[model samples]
Target chain A: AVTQSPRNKVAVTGGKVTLSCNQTNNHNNMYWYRQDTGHGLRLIHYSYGAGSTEKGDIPDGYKASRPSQENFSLILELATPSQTSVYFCASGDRLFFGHGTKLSVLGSADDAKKDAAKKDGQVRQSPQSLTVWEGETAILNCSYENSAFDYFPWYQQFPGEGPALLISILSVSDKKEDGRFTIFFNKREKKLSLHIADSQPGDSATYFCAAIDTNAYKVIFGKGTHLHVLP
Target chain B: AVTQSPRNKVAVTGGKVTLSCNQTNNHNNMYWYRQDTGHGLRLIHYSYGAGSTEKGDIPDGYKASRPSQENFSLILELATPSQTSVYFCASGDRLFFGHGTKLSVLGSADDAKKDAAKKDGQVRQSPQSLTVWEGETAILNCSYENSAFDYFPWYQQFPGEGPALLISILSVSDKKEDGRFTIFFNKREKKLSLHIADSQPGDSATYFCAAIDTNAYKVIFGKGTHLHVLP
Candidate 1:
C-alpha cells in the first residue's frame, strides 16, 4: 500500500534529486532505503508522522521529510557517483512497498566501465539445455573467465518461485559433496562441474553458475543450464 | 548468481539463527540485509572476503561473518521477538542475490496477530469488472472499515510489468489531482473514489486501493478493480 515515483532517473554528479512517496495508510512511520553496487539494501532515512524526520544507517548527503501523514520523501542534496544506488520508500510494519527508483549518476569512464562490466559480467555454461533419465547421474558444466571469482553456488529455480540454493563451494576447495550432489573445481582453469547422482524428475530446473569479482565488487553469472530429468 | 537455503524456518526465541549465503563469483565482497516489519530494508553486515566481517546500519542483536570467499552469514546469538526480519545475502556490484529467509519468533499472541493481520489487511473495491469506451472517464471506487487509515493510493498494474503509482492522497486532504486522474475521499464514511479522465485503451489494467494504518505499522490492499477500455 505504498507509491514510489520516478522509477528511473539519471542525475548529474553534484546535482540534486528528490524521490517522492505517498500513502493512504494513516501510518506513523515511513522510510527511505538504497541498494548500492556492493552494499545490499541499506536504510537511509525515516520519519515518525508529519514533521518528524530522522537519519538511518547511511544518511550522509541525503535529506528526508514527512510533510504530511500520508507523504514522505528522500532528497539527494548533493548527489555523487557513489550515490547511484537504487532507492525505495515504505510505510508501516511489513511495510507496503513502492517501485524502486534506479538512479544513475553521469560520471567518468571508469563509471562507464563499471556499467559496461555489468553487461559483460557472466560465466559460461555448456549445453545450454540438458536432459537425462531419472535415476541417472546428471552432469552440468560451468566455467568463468576471471580468476577473482572464488565462490561457486549452484542455484535451482523452479517456475513461479524464487531460486533455491541447492549447494555451493569455495575456490580453495577442489571438491565438495552433499547428499546426491557433488562439485568438482579446477581453479587454474576457472572451471567447475556439478554431478547430481540419481537424478529425479523433481531435480529438473534451471541451474545457474555464477562468479563474483571481489576487487571490483562485480558478479558474473553463467547463462544457466536448463536440465530436464525425465522418467 | 546466488543461492539461499532453508526457504522456511521457525526459529526459537532466545535461540540463535544463521542466515547463510554462497556464490560462485570470485567476489571480494558479501553482505547480509534484513527487512523488518516497519523498518523497511536495512543492511546488517558485510565482509570483504573470508575471515572479515563488518557491521552495517543496524548492528544490535545480530552478528555476521565471511568465513570463506564464497560464504557470508548473519547471526543472532540470542534471537528476540523484536529481531524478526526477512533476511537476504549478496555478492559484488550490481550484486547477484539469494532467496531471502523469512524468520519468525515462536511466541507472542500479538506477533501471531501481526502475522494474521497481514492476511486480514485489505480495503474493499466494488464492481470488480468495468468496461468503458476509450475517451470516456472511468470511475473506480474504494473504501475501508477502519477509521485509522489516513493514506489512500490507487495503484495501476499492467500485465508483464510492475505496478505503477497512478495517484494518491492523504486523509487530511479530501482530494488530489494528477494528469487525467482525481481522488475524492470521505473520512466519515471511510471511503474514496478514483476518476480517470478520458480513459484510453492504455488505461486498461488492474487498479488496487491501499490503506496504511501508521500507528499499527500495517498496510491493507483492495483486490484490484479490473478495468477494460475498449477501442
Candidate 2:
C-alpha cells in the first residue's frame, strides 16, 4: 500500500499546502493525482527520478517534485476553496493508490457565499441505502427508515457485472464475520448491520440489500447503496 | 475512440486464435486490461449496463460482451499450442479497469506431450536510451510475444508521479498530432512512429507507448522510451 501523510487537513485560502507520499516498492515511477466528480481523475504531476519534476495536463495550479526515489510531493502554492478535494499519490506502473487526503480550504470570502448556497445537508441515501465517504468508517445498520421492509442480504456489484455475494446474515445475528466486514443486528430494535473497518476505493460500487418477506417469497430492495468512496 | 464486437465467444483445441477489436470514436473512453503481472491492472468485468461493454483486467479465457457500444473480443480455449493468459476490460475512470481472469489449463493430452516451452518476449526501455524496431515501413516498436498488444498510446513521465498522456493514436491512425508529439501509424503495415516535434532536456524522462483494447481497456506498456533530450 502506498502510504500518505496527513490523512485530512484544513488550509487557509492563499496558504501553501503540501501533500506528501512515500512508497517503499522500489518502482521507478510515481504519480500525483486528484479526483473530482465531473473531472473523474486527472494527473497533476509525475516523476521518474530523485530530484526530478514534470507538469501534468492539469498542472496550472499544482506543483510536484520527487525529492528522492521513495518520496513525492504535490504542493499547492496558493490554496483555494476550489482546490479542496481528495489528493492521491501512487507509485509503480501497477499504481497502488494511497488512502488519499481530504482537503478543505477555509478563510476565503467567496467560500462563505458558496457555503450559504450549498445544500451540504442533503441525505443522498434512500431508506435502504447506506453511504460512507471513502476512507472514513462505514457502518451499515439496516433498520427500515420505513418500518415495513425486513430480512436483508447485502450484495455488491461493479459496473456492468453481476453482483457478487459479500456476506449474508439474517436479521438476527447481533454480530457476524471477521474484522473487515461485520454485521450487527438488533432484532428487537428491528435493525440489521454491516460494518467496514476501512472503506476503500475498491469498495466504491453499488450495494444492494435484498429485503424479503419469507412467507410471501416477496422481496423489495432498498433502492441501492451507491457508496461514493470519495478520494 | 474504438469499438469491439462478438459480445461473447468460445473456443477449443491448441489452435491459434485472434481476438479482434474496432473503434470509431466520435468521442471516446476506450481501453483493454489484463492481469497476472504484479502491479499490472486487475479489473475483471464491467459494462455500463447499457449498450457498450468496457474492458476489465483478467479477461483471458473468456470472450467479452459488446452491445453496439462498439465491440471487442478475446479468443482462446485452444490447447495444442497451449496458450494461457490473464484478461481484463476497461473504460474511462482514469481508464477504469476490470478485474482479471487467469487461464492455464491445457485441453488435451497431446499438448502435454508436445513439451513445447513458450517464452514470453518482453521489451524494456531505459532513460536516455533510444532503440527502434523496424518492419518494411520503419516501425517504431516495442517487442512482446503475447500477440494481444494492439492499442498504442505514448505516456510521458517526469520525476515523481504518474504518467501523463502525451498521445494515444490507435493502430488504425496513419497520423496524429498534438503540439509536441506526433505519431505516424500504419495499420496494415504493422508499423508505428512517434516523433517528438521538438527536443528539450526538460522533456527528459520516460515515455511509454501502450497497446490496449477498448473492450477490456487493459494496456501493456512498452519497456519505455527513455528520452534524455540533450540541451
What C-alpha lDDT values do all the predictions have? 0.77, 0.58
- The per-residue C-alpha lDDT of model 1 at residue B58 equals 77
> Once superposed on the true structure, which residue ranges of model 2 sit more than 4 Å away at CA?
A114-231, B1-231
Q: Candidate 2 residues A70-167, lDDT tens each?
A: 89988899998888887878776544567678889886667686665442211122334455667687765445432343455676767645345577
Contacts from the true interface found in each model, as a fraction, amount to 0.04, 0.00
Q: DockQ values for all predictions?
A: 0.06, 0.03
Model 2 earns a TM-score of 0.29
Estimated TM-score for each candidate: 0.35, 0.29
Q: Candidate 2's error at B25, in angstroms?
A: 49
What lDDT score is found at residue A231 in candidate 2?
61
Weakest 10 consecutive residues, lDDT, candidate 1 chain B?
B34-43
Tens digit of per-residue lDDT, candidate 1, span A33-105: 7754333346688887799998886789989988889889888888788888668787764355576788897
